[PDB]
Amino acid sequence: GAMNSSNYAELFNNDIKLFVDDTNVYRVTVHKTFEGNVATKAINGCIFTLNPKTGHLFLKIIHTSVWAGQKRLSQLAKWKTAEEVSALVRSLPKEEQPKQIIVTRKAMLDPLEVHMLDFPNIAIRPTELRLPFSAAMSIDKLSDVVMKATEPQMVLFNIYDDWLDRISSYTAFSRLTLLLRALKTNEESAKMILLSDPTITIKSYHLWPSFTDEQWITIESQMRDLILTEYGRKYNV
Amino acid sequence: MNTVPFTSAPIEVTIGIDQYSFNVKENQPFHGIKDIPIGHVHVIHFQHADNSSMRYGYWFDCRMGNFYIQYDPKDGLYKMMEERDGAKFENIVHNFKERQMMVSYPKIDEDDTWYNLTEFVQMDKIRKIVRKDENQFSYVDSSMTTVQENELSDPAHSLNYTVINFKSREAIRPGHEMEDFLDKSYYLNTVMLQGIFKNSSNYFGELQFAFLNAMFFGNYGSSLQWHAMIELICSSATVPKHMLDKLDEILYYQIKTLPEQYSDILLNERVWNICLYSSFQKNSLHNTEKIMENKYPELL
DSSP states (O other): OOBOSTTOGGGGSSSOEEEEEOTTSSEEEEEEOTTSOEEEEEEOEEEEEEOTTTOEEEEEEEOGGGGTTOSSHHHHHHHHHHHHHHHHHHHSOGGGSOSEEEESSGGGHHHHHHHTTTOTTSEEEOBOSOOOGGGGGGSHHHHHHHHHOSSOEEEEEETTTTGGGTSOHHHHHHHHHHHHHHHHHOHHHHHHHHHSOTTSOOOTTOSSOOOOHHHHHHHHHHHHHHHHHHHHHHHTO | OEEEEBSOOOSOEEEEETTEEEEEOTTOOOOEEEEEOTTSOEEEEEEESSOOSOOEEEEEOGGGOEEEEEEETTTTEEEEEEEOOHHHHHHHHHHHHHTTOOEEOOOOTTOOHHHHHHTTOOHHHHHHHSOOTTOSSEEEESSOOBHHHHHOOOGGGOBOOOOOOSSSTTTOOTTOHHHHHHOTHHIIIIIIIIIIIOSHHHHHHHHHHHHHHHHHHOOHHHHHHHHHHHHHHHTOSOOOHHHHHHHHHHHHHHHHHSOGGGTTTSSOHHHHHIIIIISTTGGGOHHHHHHHHHHOGGGO
């Protein structure tokens, strides 16, 4: 059924599964018109399809052109996600298609489910986790390719860089989500922490600095400290 | 006017005929129901005084033969049977009338209620949903499950209602995924009406029969079937105006007839708020809407 802290370590077993985060598919700015009415201007967006076990991310860039002359665009965004997720599965060889797709937002259940009718043995599941995938556009290199695109485009990444060479998927996925949680709650500080030291660099084929084991620990502790500070500020605790 | 005689009444039982019902005491001299209007389907049904569980009953139409009821002590229930000997039947019916042991189908003459609840219900269709073709009449009870309910065990005893499922291949044309799922007109009009039912009267007949089985036997899957057939229409942007008008009459008399105390299990909160207030057809059910608001405002 739904995914919560009870059945958490399932993410890392050997059943292929994908997460689908749709929060950044439809992205607008809100501005005032000459007549003083409000209007929206859409910018390029993306679907955040992620295999928590391997790091493989299927960044499906959504070009503003797809909204042209359409109504109820937020409702449509959900169906475009499910249409793109479905064509991604179909594009993959059978032994690579996922056995479960977990949507980060229950509103995706019905559009995915309908688009996956060709795949009755693929379980579409909601989650009760509060995952921070929306902060994915705080990753400079993912925001950069989204914003530069001039057409629909799929860009493949490993979101764990080379971490798995030294840590488990479990640990990778917790480092990922700590980082993204920190990027969500206070982007400016989070990014300060990651980059202060100019002597720790991002390999051209990587998303995050090439921290050593010892440096990741210091980073992880700073990120934790950031997130606990921001909570106290939010709630006056 | 037709007659359904009873051989005896060995056990205390509440007897229903259509929307009317009578208490009958153990081995009270009761020998049947007279003056039943020819021209419509009818359902005679039963609830034993000892076992308020399992309401059961038989759909029938008098034009199709001479039917009577006989208690069966091995099986413990009132069984409908057919007398093929015409003379021997009129002989029994005449003598019980002379002895006046039969209640009279108590129809007020202003009342179209039973006509309106059964307008499109035809016995030939009833016998395809309840397949048991050695009998002209059709047995249903509380616990019978439907074909859809069996998919998600004994098919001899199944209610073979038409399977409706909004998230199926049937209902969703490839490439119109979003369109067909927010606007079911395709499913309703081409797949179901033109495809399977052939015409709206057969659709409405199934819907009405599902409703009566829910109401007279609290058959849970029949209740699910009615709601499904209502939902499909209310969720279709494009419906023949004559269907919308007849539906509005149909539901009105169903809402009207329903026991006030059962509105908690027989009426699905979500389907009805969607039909009356969210769907394409929100503004098309003026009689149903008005009657639902004044009688069951709480459900809404």
